[PDB]
Design an enzyme around this catalytic site. Structure first.
Site, PDB file in Angstrom:
ATOM      1  N   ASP A  34       0.730  -1.262   0.000  1.00 24.05           N
ATOM      2  CA  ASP A  34       0.000   0.000   0.000  1.00 24.05           C
ATOM      3  C   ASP A  34       0.759   1.311   0.000  1.00 24.05           C
ATOM      4  OD1 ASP A  34      -2.229   1.812   0.474  1.00 24.05           O
ATOM      5  OD2 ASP A  34      -2.385   1.144   2.524  1.00 24.05           O
ATOM      6  N   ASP A 215      -2.448   5.947  -4.728  1.00 24.31           N
ATOM      7  CA  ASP A 215      -2.511   4.928  -3.677  1.00 24.31           C
ATOM      8  C   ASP A 215      -2.624   3.516  -4.140  1.00 24.31           C
ATOM      9  OD1 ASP A 215      -5.346   4.690  -1.414  1.00 24.31           O
ATOM     10  OD2 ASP A 215      -3.623   3.417  -1.416  1.00 24.31           O
TER      11      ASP A 215
END
Ligand SMILES: CCCCNC(=O)[C@H](C)C[C@H](O)[C@@H](N)C[C@@H](C)CNC(=O)c1ccccc1OCCCOC
Length: 329
Positions: A34, A215
């Site tokens: 992430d 992201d």
């Protein structure tokens, strides 16, 4: 000065994740790499059965590993999509080639929506120490403290092998020509400045600038509930509970959108953002864009996730605070 890489699995274009090995002998776990958080975390064996989540996922039990030394700090992680909570431990994660002694949270209260819809098990953040809850040196900053990599950078490929992360480099056989970069806005977050969202060919959203979290840990482009509410209204899509949607035959006429990112226009046509699972009328298809309101301080921001990284290979460049996009392939 080496370049390793993680092959990633793709589940239904909404979830890309990979493998790490916590512990001696290796306890494997599927995880999301992430770029918008900075902790490693894996469900624990201590995760009480009541967490419908924990009982259905592979989970860590220190009991079986020579090198687990440990610390017991409670930490609580408030992702924009839920909270998870556990304490933290010490042991080794080997992330695609490199072994390092890491602190990771072993989670416990692990809430069903949404962790029950997730084929992965944990999360390996790759954001800055500025948001490591617990202010704990993050896995990328350790691969680099025992620095072995070629460039202290990494990049993500998400296929339309499901995709790959390359540590230390950029597999230049998965993109068409030269990344254009964008230096950061804050340092501390992978967030760039976006100036103008357009549909068709007129700036309709974002004219006096807005922010953009790139992201890797997100399935779709997301925007604040107001802005998506107008984005969709110019696309003509329709709301239906979990997502905007438009009937599959209109699919290839919904206009294109272009995120003005830094120096060029990142254009996504409808084949890019629409799940054309049938060109037919009568069933109606989904749009890969979602409303999400990321809270201050990271947000309020658009967040460009998998719907976007899938058309542009993305190099996150630690060394001099730039993200760099280069067309897909
Ligand atoms: C308090 C520490 C975190 C502070 N930062 C944040 O909350 C970020 C802004 C957001 C955060 O990075 C998210 N990207 C976290 C990520 C784990 C989001 N994943 C999930 O919520 C999730 C859950 C169930 C199913 C899918 C989910 O997304 C996975 C998409 C992975 O495919 C790439």
């Amino acid at each position: 000065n080496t370049t390793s890489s993680v092959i990633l699995t793709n589940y239904m274009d909404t979830q890309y994740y990979g493998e790490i090995g916590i512990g001696t002998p290796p306890q494997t776990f599927k995880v999301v790499f992430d770029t918008g958080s900075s902790n490693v975390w894996v469900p624990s064996s201590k995760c009480s059965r009541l967490y419908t989540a924990c009982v259905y996922h592979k989970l860590f039990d220190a009991s079986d590993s020579s090198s687990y030394k440990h610390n017991g700090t409670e930490l609580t992680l408030r992702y924009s999509t839920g909270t998870v909570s556990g304490f933290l431990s010490q042991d080794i994660i080997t992330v695609g080639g490199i072994t390092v002694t890491q602190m990771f949270g072993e989670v416990t209260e692990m809430p069903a929506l949404p962790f029950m819809l997730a084929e992965f098990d944990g999360v390996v953040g790759m954001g800055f120490i500025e948001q490591a809850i617990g202010r704990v040196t993050p896995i990328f900053d350790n691969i680099i403290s025992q620095g072995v990599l070629k460039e202290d950078v990494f990049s993500f490929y998400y296929n339309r092998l499901g995709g790959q992360i390359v540590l230390g480099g950029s597999d230049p056989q998965h993109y068409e020509g030269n990344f254009h970069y964008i230096n950061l806005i804050k340092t501390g977050v992978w967030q760039i400045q976006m100036k103008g969202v357009s549909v068709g060919s007129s700036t309709l959203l974002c004219e006096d600038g807005c922010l953009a979290l790139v992201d890797t840990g997100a399935s779709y482009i997301s925007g604040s509930t107001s802005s998506i509410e107008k984005l969709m209204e110019a696309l003509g899509a329709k709301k239906r509970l979990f997502d905007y949607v438009v009937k599959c035959n209109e699919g290839p006429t919904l206009p294109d959108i272009s995120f003005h990112l830094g120096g060029k226009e990142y254009t996504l046509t409808s084949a890019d953002y629409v799940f054309q699972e049938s060109y037919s009328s009568k069933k109606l298809c989904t749009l890969a864009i979602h409303a999400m309101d990321i809270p201050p301080p990271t947000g309020p921001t658009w967040a460009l996730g998998a719907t976007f990284i899938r058309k542009f290979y993305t190099e996150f460049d630690r060394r001099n605070n730039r993200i760099g996009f280069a067309l897909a392939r």
